[PDB]
């Protein structure tokens, strides 16, 4: 019935190619039922010290994809679930990722607030967390 590590396995079979991310994103977008489940799993995975920066950045791309495409699907369930964990994950990666990677996530999170992907309540928390880490 339920495939074990169905989400985890896909995260380890992705590439930095849009054709790859889209293949997993479109697969997740059809199963919005597990929105809160994949959201916490994503969060937990990126919080694991066993996950190298390569995998962290890869998983981050999948999040941007599903939350952005969710606008067309009109499924706020994804944005809601991923939004509450995004503020945490973004705050963590922004304090561990190098200069070259922080810049990449900057444009990723920028488009999220520019396109009003998440609620203003959490959006204001994400942007402030990024600035807080810059307070030394």
């Amino acid at each position: 019935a339920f495939s074990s590590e169905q989400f985890t396995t896909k995260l380890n079979t992705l590439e930095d190619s849009q054709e790859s991310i889209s293949s997993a994103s479109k697969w997740l977008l059809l199963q919005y039922r597990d929105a809160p489940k994949v959201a916490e799993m994503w969060k937990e995975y990126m919080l694991r010290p066993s996950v190298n920066t390569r995998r962290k950045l890869l998983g981050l791309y999948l999040m941007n994809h599903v939350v952005q495409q969710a606008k067309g699907q009109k499924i706020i369930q994804f944005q809601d679930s991923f939004g509450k964990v995004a503020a945490e994950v973004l705050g963590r990666i922004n304090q561990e990722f190098p200069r070259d990677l922080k810049k990449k996530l900057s444009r990723v999170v920028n488009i999220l607030k520019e396109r009003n992907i998440f609620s203003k309540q959490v959006v204001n928390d994400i942007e402030r967390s990024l600035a807080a880490a810059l307070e030394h």
Binding site: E15, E19, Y61, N64, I111
Partner: peptide, 9 residues
């Protein structure tokens, strides 16, 4: 191939 937010698919 490089992934950018403006080019997801």
């Amino acid at each position: 191939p490089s992934y950018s937010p403006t080019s997801p698919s």
